[PDB]
Design a protein around this nucleic acid. Sequence first.
RNA 1: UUGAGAAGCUCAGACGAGUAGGCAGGCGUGGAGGUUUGUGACGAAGCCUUGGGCGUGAGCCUGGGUCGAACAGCCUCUAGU
RNA 2: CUGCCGAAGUUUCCGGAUAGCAGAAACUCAGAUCAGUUUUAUGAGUAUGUAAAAUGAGAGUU
RNA 3: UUUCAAUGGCCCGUCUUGAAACACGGACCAAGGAGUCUAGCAUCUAUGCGAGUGUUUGGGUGAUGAAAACCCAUCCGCGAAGUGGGAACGCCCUUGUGGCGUGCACC
Lengths: 49, 135, 52, 51, 210, 116
Amino acid sequence: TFVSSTMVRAAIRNQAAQRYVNRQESKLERQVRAQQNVIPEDPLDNVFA
Amino acid sequence: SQRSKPASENVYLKLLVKLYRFLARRTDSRFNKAILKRLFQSKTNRPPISISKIAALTSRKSASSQNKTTVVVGTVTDDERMLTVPKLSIAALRFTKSARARILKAGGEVLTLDQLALRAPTGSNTVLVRGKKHA
Amino acid sequence: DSVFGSTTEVAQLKKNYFLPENIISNADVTRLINSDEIQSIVKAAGPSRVKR
Amino acid sequence: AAARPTVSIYNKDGSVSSETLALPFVFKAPIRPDLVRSVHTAVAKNKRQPY
Amino acid sequence: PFIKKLAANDRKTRDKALESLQRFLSQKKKFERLDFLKLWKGLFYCMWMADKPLYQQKLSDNLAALVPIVWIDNRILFQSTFWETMGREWTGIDILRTDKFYLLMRRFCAAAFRDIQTRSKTALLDKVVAEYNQMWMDGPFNTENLAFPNGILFHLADIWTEELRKVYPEDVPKADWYLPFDSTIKSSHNVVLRKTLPKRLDRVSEYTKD
Amino acid sequence: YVKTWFNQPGRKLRRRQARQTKAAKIAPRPVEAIRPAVKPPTIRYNMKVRAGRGFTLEELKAAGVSRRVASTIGIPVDHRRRNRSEESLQRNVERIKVYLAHLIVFPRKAGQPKKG
RNA sequence: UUGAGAAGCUCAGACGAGUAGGCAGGCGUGGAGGUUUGUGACGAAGCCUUGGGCGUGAGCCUGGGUCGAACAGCCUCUAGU
RNA sequence: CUGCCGAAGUUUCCGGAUAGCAGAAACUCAGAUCAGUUUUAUGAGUAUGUAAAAUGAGAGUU
RNA sequence: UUUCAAUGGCCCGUCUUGAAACACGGACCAAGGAGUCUAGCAUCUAUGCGAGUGUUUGGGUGAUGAAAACCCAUCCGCGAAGUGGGAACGCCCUUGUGGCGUGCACC
């Protein structure tokens, strides 16, 4: 019938364990999406350059 | 922050209100009156709409998206959950950098409300939409 | 152009910075109001300050 | 849109040169007097000494 | 021309670049569309920087008269790229500058009609008009793009018949002169454009196929 | 009792001058010692690699640097840490070896008595 | 017809007590950034005055007298206002 | 300093939760409803009540 | 402006209570003199960005004032993972009909 009082401490420690990794994955995916969401350069933006 | 005039201090929102004040007064379009009313509203009463919701609402039930412009007086954010963006023509106050790039790179055009007023001064063939006000 | 960049190209000297976009495209609102696109559909303008 | 394309360069003697620079995109940025004033109001308080 | 000099800040260099453009546009070699689009970016700003009404209505004549100088093979491309570069820059113009670009289209509308007449001497008129109607329908009067401003097309409707009568003062032959207007009234998705274009247009059925 | 931070810009400058004062004393050598690469001791961070305190005696022995000369050339020694896995041993031995590949050690004068 | 500080101009009708309370727009003071290519020993500031004027009002402008070195309008910021 | 809005001053349980009075916001809604009002006749007991006429006002709201 | 004539006209502020009254405070004048600063929380508005957002613990940097401004490595906080109906189209002399309905409320 349910777990030791220390297992609740293990439960919250496992919840926060993925906090760092999920932040790293979310940051990496955002950069990859932003890399692929690049507006193509207009062939006329540098006509007078 | 409503009713007579916008409480916003942006000069470019004041210029858009100037344009649609004329359109709402010198035409018989309830679209121009509706756009003018929503230009006066606060940021809380103009919730953002997503790229996914625009794609879903246009091709809804009977679908038949055709080429009607989608107008929202608010921000068009991006839904990274969806993988393929259809060809959409959207007019909005603001587009995010992700939403704008995804519409342009695979799809059609992003417009401002003054570019829309030149294309459809009476608002004809437009899909006016709103965001979910319930946060 | 490296300090600020553009609206579509990132600034070289500011990481992940793009120039802000405007909620209006042509800020000359008299050009839009007095354009052939708009003036061809408006109803005949009433008078200016009206007679009493 | 439709801004002036290029900018002329002036020599140290005050005469125009044959070289021009394309106008940078920052001069096309929105001019926001309300937003500049609000940021200036805050930034001007950042060198105050306590009393 | 080098395009950069065509948009220079002094009128002398812009005038010199225009004079050197006649040799450039006369070469008997094929020009890509992007090359003409880059050229019309400089030529647009040559007109955009024009100062006084006497100059900017003589400069418009110079640009319009530049069409017959272009080689026959890439003459349609020159006109097609002008109407593309005017469609994408029309809204960026301001009120104090539209009245001189309005005359630029009118001078270029007449340039197309004159070029049709010039080609009609050596070839059948129907073939030349079909070539131009393809250019008109693939560019400005195209219904597949909704971004082309209605101000260009309303102006074209207003001046279509009068600039045609100028090229043929005695009488004009029968051809599909108004085909782009009929095609775009019937098929365009712009309700405002298709509802008031017949009112603006002065289609004279007397010299069109019935 | 309120702790104000009006000296925050002053402390930034004071620490910068300490870095420059140190670099003035030790001209060609780095202002910091080389730190090892270790893994934080928890399931939340054990996938990250951070900087350690010093190199273990087994790391120094493998790389060829004795613990008595390691400190003289700017290699910290951690007698407490140990290599429980072969990956930590290889990650930090290579760090030492790359450090020794980029190192110019200036010679020192030695006293040589005339007689035997 | 020029009467687009569109935040402007214009037309019409109705209404007007007010405690607690609520909401707008303004007046004034010390200091700050900007501005008036600002005022000042040919007289700044202050003070006096049955001088004159402006505003519904808070207040402001001015003549004369006195006086002797500094001071103000506008946009914004600030508060021991 | 001026302008505008403007109470309650008490039912109910019980220092309050209220309600109610007075404003703000979010609405929809004249092809609709509302009312310190009078009615038509019959229901019950001149009064009282009823559903649907007259008069006025656009109203209902959260 | 001083005064005269005719008409009217109480002493303010507080407290009280039904308004009062009454009782309190006030010899006069000048100067000083009372909702401030800060840390939370919630609301509304504005602004920036937006499935993200937050540079200023700190580092870099700033030749002329360097407590400013400018730049950001790794973390971290928070966040996240049937009908009615606005608007528009096409018909209908118009009403009205037909196709299409966002938000929200019903099912």
